[PDB]
Assembly symmetry: D2
Homo-oligomer: 497 residues x 4
């Protein structure tokens, strides 16, 4: 469906105007299902990014949005939520066109996105600070929460609009001015949400959209002196660089990098549930969702049976066009990403692991032109291997065995990451013991994947800094100010007269 | 009084043992009043720092402190507070010996320190997380707050034990394990507080003290993979380096880097109060306290009179030995710091400002051997000058005029810093308008200097990242985990059978 | 006429619009002309019992109480949207029923929308706490649940606004409710129940009882299946309700109005203070719960203030609330106008001066309605009954004071504690006074503001508990401490 | 005849404490305090008058209005509350012995109590300066909106005979931490530890009138404490009948009430419970403090497949419970509190019989020589009963348990909730998921999963339904002693011009 695109903007949005790149450069956007060019958009310059940042500062300083009532900001955020639902069908199709995920996955996404905006809309006017009981007589002490200021927001290619919603909603609810740059390879739904936000109506410069991967654009967004918070979701290497650049101005950072999310299955788990959720954990969005569970840890007494049950089902996963109802798994996002996955299979082999199923591009005629990769299970591996220690971010799972509860915890925590993970067991007490010991921002007990606006999401260790979603997510966009009034000021007379 | 030192430890404290440096290196500690060597301590190695970090990790993982009840942690933090009060006299004298500040200032410090530990002791068991209303039927969602983990803590020379208290108290209250390194030039009260903490009794490895050059062990304390939070208070250049190092492991950072704190005096201020508090803001601890007000902004109609009234009083400030009750202002901290202050006077002159009073080392016989510098007032300057834009951190103030409320706000915000500031005016409504527009973490209305454990302290912009003190200060030492239990788990059956 | 042509005339119990069990009815009056405008069911005590039992059944079924908080919020938001959609007709109905101006009713409907919206947004924002247990190997959590079955009795001043303050949190939290509006002003409440039915809630979640039938109030306050009784109205009725609630140790929330003081210092903005004294005294003919009937004015400006106030009072335009030029409508009922008249007799007997007003207006177009002239009473003091007792009408008293300390002492010399104002350009002084006033809401250089984001309620005899804000929501929740011992060991205290 | 235990009462005050002075009753009336172990008079104290209570209330109001305590910094109030806590620990031994002397409970139970009481004061000391209100994001442009929390004002506090000093600590600690002024009246039959804690509080030092102690059950004293116009909150713990009367009196001034009236606390034992744990905890639930603690579990609901075995195991152990002097280390259960209370328990056994229940064991006063003079009653198990009986529907507050069977999870929940009460209860099952389902459906302020009795200052305690109004302990408990004030400042006030000029 190209007609989606006939009225879609191809430009950046800076200081209230849809504008081309300063040098008129463009980029061709691809559909991963067939590798065909589907759209062409502006490829911005570092100067365009600077300009958007300066526009955001100007707007912030003008106070039109930062001084708007929180109730009114909430209404405007709610109007965005309603736009998302109104345009659910076209937004879902656009996300499927751009990212390759199934239309059913995109629908679920748009429902979630609506709920993200709705949550933050409702939160906007619920906490402006606190009154402090001052330990000094005849003083009044209060903490006032203000918008952090100017924020730069960089989003990834896995769930572009969802990740955008997680950043935009609190930023707008709190009164910040923002500059957003989506992944250079998946900008379509982000352009669309900016059109919608423009329709809702915000003061000029409050929201700005930069497009591309232009030289130093990232560096400007992370290193500009007028930025108060840089919020980045993406690769670990890029994130570290971003944090180093933010240091030059002592700028707050929020990072969500990925993680190797463990899926711990005890022998007293509901076996069929555990297999089902291992599949779901490994292969939803071809294993590219941030919540993906690529590291299965299964108790030794059920390991052999578990491995086979998993493989039996992996063999039946239906690959195809995300627009087709029968498709269960779409393609991976890009050539570069598929190549990384292929190199990892080589690593697995070199280390002596077994490719139990999958591990190559599918041959089928209707899959030949797209960026498909078979769902894969790697067995006979251990925590010392690169394939276990490094996240591939593809439709690939590893399987390790464990003997004891203590061992499962130790193995699961033997990782540089700390994003999310699950424990499966009918023994809820045991599951809760494991959950309390796992160094992960989210632990699921007898589930896999859930996240929602009402609860914070983020990582321990190298999976990130800070939180998105929930009240903690909103707090990344606020800054505290202690105003202390002396209501009966007297000279101190410490120095001589 | 060097009997204060006859049983003071000269060693580091690592994994429950007082130990020398791995290479037996030492450093001579000086009294700034007379530049005499007063004590010799171990000068630790980068391997000593690594060892302390590994000990903190081991202890953390053992759970003896991290899994102790919050109530019990609070009792132990309270026992520290009680030790501080019990040893108030000797601790105050030690701080005066090491830092040069007056004994009265040290006494006030020790009272404050007691109150910091007491506040956090009381906070320890007041919030373990929250229950979330899950949007998914048949699920329980909770957010549990855990200690962040292993923390490294680097403190400055201005208020060594105070700054230590701000970091140690929440770290211990929340169940973290810590490695602390005080300023290489002022370690004495920090050594002493470690002896006191050891007496209170903590599991081995919970607290560790490293001594010596930040240039040796700093990179390890900021860049080690087993650290979960690096908390640094000190110079801006060092802080940026520390944050860039922390990025290598995506490590949380908390920074307080000082600031050029404005003191805004309107023509309807209580005049005598404003002069008094300008003196206090400029010259308490020879202008070296983090709350110092070096940038005075005074309304033009009272400026000429204000300048003279300030100068009249500056001429009478009594410099001397901090142990002498008549002393109002002690020396500055070191040769290096005094040299920086002298270079700044040269800058002021080169830029065309006037040294209205002071601006040199005092001549008097009893002051000749110490690191004294005269309280100084610089006039005829403006916001474009280096002397206005750069913080000297000494007994020096600049005076700028302003015509309007709007101008005062614009000038005060024309700075890279954002730590604290004051507004003086009998028109409380106007003071509140100004306070709301100042980009500062603390604004005082008709006061100067107050800070206290009940309220968060920290900076906007280049003054820092995060907060110390208050509930927010405690929160730096916690991490959130969302535990989601599915209480009626069903297969999803997204994939084929 | 078409405004009422499709409006239900019945009660709403367990998902059905029903007549009274005895088919009794009550004629509803328009205070502007005293004409009967509508006829509705006058329920029985058995009807009230049946609604309470229906609410309990629904609560126990869990369809609403176990609905997700996010979904409950969407439903409460849908109510808010209905209010805005029907803003025009709802405003006209409130004016018809209560007599207040159409402009006042419009403002009301905008506010009511915002009340539902606020609570919709709050519904899913706090489910309880994790506690750091002092017992090793235990998990301690506090789960917040709906309080249960709630009865809600509302007054005649701002019927739909007061209904919104109660309904919004009750629904957001998952309670089941039984509401009874003032017998004399049920129209907008019937309408909002039609709208809520359209939004769609499980049968029994919401129920509407109409009337002042024998023992109906007593059933709503004294039934064993009720978990909270929330009442807004007169002090005498509130006390009776609390005594009845005691028979089952039932939570009560009460809002009983108050003598709200308006303190004007000589350094106030003078014209602002006169303007706001008028607004405080005479908005809704002085019948709004935020009304300021007790003016305390500093002696040095008192004479000038009194005359400025009187000059303006003489020009206040009385008339039909539907007419744009009307500034003040009639009072609510014959009984209420009679209470106001008896208070003027008291004022005279005590030796106060009726400086202006104090009687029914004569004008031809006003003759048939329940009008009472805006009134200013001067030369009075805190020892008088007129100053100690609130009349809740278009009447203000004026007392002088010399000092800040005296103003505070006078303002606190009252059984009430609902709201009040301080007018002064000296903000530090206004803040000192505000901190010392025993009132749930204090305005500095303003009069009347209230809003869903902040709690409203009274100290002393003005009430128990709060409505609006997070505290208001909390009246509809109950805390449960669930403590799990994760390594239970025998205690072995008793011998084996 | 002298013995070292006399040092315990020799210097203990016998008077009330009003407006900073230890004073006798206005009419010099006194009351004899008894030790329930031997029914001997152990001490004589003032029995105050209604005028004494009025005077204390007026003193509290005066003090509150003076602001010396209400305007003290929260930090400083916390230090003072902490000093009280430290006094409790310092005098732990004597306070425990005194509580055992006055109430009859074992010395080990009193020791545990004093540790708890210390922790209560410590918890509130720590809480005192942690929340002064909120800044509100105002929907009106050019306004500032804040909520300031103030002490509620003058509070009256009436405590029961079961855990006199513990219940006193639950009330005093938040009242002082928040800056209220208080008037406290302990149970007329158990005032000793309350007098002692007032001596200790006076040592710590508070402004005159901030704390006041009334003693007795004098005519209309209760009525003055619940119905006086100068009171802002009445907090009562005790019987349901008294609580209702108190609430009705509080209504005359529209006065806030906080009530804790006890309850019939269910102990639900599934067939997949740890059997020996469940029998152990059923004993603990039924018989700690002779079943007089407020957390007592008198209503056992046991799944039918293990009911017979459970009933016999319970009875086998009940036969071995050691009754005796609370001061003796071997004592497992002490006497009941008074003659009137023991009589109520005896009349309930008559009711049980009339209704057709079986007294499986106990049900009478013990015969043994060393128990003959005290207010002892045998630990009792009543079987073959059902939810329609008075003995199941009404709480006896003694060393008595009833045992009902149930077949299903749904049935257990239904039966457990078929009660006018709502204080606390337990679920025993190795199936934690099931226990959690049951816990969420029970209409009780506290639910224990595989435990019985725990309460602590960090978590609120209170009842649904007729067990009470409001909460004690935790942040919610502190909040009973605070009142909210919304201060709204218009920072750019403009005339409205609604009325014509
Ligand atoms: Na991290
Ligand atoms: Na300085
Ligand atoms: Na910063
Ligand atoms: Na009125
Ligand atoms: Na009240
Ligand atoms: Na109740």
């Amino acid at each position: 469906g190209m007609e989606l695109l006939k009225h879609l903007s191809q430009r950046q949005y800076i200081d209230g105007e849809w504008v081309e790149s300063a040098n008129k450069n463009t980029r061709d956007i691809i559909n991963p299902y067939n590798q065909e060019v589907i759209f062409t958009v502006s490829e911005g310059t570092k100067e365009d990014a600077e300009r958007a940042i300066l526009a955001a500062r100007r707007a912030f300083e003008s106070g039109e949005w930062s001084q708007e009532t929180a109730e009114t900001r909430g209404k405007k955020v709610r109007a965005i939520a309603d736009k998302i639902k109104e345009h659910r069908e076209a937004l879902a199709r656009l996300e499927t066109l751009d990212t390759g995920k199934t239309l059913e996955e995109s629908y679920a996404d748009m429902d979630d996105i609506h709920n993200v905006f709705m949550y933050f809309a409702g939160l906007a006017d619920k906490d402006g600070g606190e009154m402090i009981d001052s330990p000094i007589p005849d003083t009044e002490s209060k903490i006032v929460k203000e918008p952090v200021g100017v924020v730069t927001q960089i989003t990834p290619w896995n769930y572009p609009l969802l990740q955008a919603s997680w950043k935009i909603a609190p930023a707008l609810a709190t009164g910040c001015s923002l500059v957003m740059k989506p992944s250079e390879i998946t900008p379509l739904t982000t352009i669309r949400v900016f059109e919608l936000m423009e329709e809702v109506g915000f003061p000029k410069g409050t929201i700005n959209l930069i497009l591309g991967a232009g030289s130093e654009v990232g560096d400007v967004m992370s290193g500009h002196k007028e930025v108060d918070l840089v919020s980045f979701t993406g690769s670990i290497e890029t994130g570290k660089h971003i944090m180093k650049n933010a240091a030059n101005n002592v700028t707050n950072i929020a990072l969500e990098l990925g993680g190797k999310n463990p899926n711990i299955i005890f022998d007293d788990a509901d076996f069929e549930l555990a297999v089902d959720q291992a599949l779901n954990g490994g292969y939803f969005h071809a294993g590219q969702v941030c919540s993906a569970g690529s590291r299965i840890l299964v108790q030794n007494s059920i390991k052999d049976k578990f491995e086979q049950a998993l493989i039996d089902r992996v063999k039946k996963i239906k690959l195809g066009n995300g627009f087709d109802a029968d498709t269960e798994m779409g393609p991976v996002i890009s050539t570069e990403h598929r190549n990384k996955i292929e190199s990892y299979m080589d690593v697995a082999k070199a280390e002596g692991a077994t490719i139990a199923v999958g591990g190559k591009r599918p041959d089928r005629d209707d899959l030949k032109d797209g960026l498909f990769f078979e769902p894969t299970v790697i067995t006979n591996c251990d925590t010392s291997m690169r394939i276990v220690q490094e996240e591939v971010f593809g439709p690939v799972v590893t399987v390790e065995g464990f003997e004891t509860e203590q061992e499962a915890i130790q193995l699961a925590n033997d990782s540089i990451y700390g994003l999310a993970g699950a424990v499966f067991s009918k023994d809820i007490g045991k599951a809760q013991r494991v959950a309390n010991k796992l160094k992960l921002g989210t632990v699921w007990i007898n589930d896999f994947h859930p996240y929602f606006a009402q609860a914070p999401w983020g990582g321990y260790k190298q999976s990130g800094i800070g939180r998105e979603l929930g009240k903690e997510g909103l707090e990344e966009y606020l800054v505290s100010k202690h105003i202390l009034t002396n209501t009966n000021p007297q000279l101190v007379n410490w120095f001589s007269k």
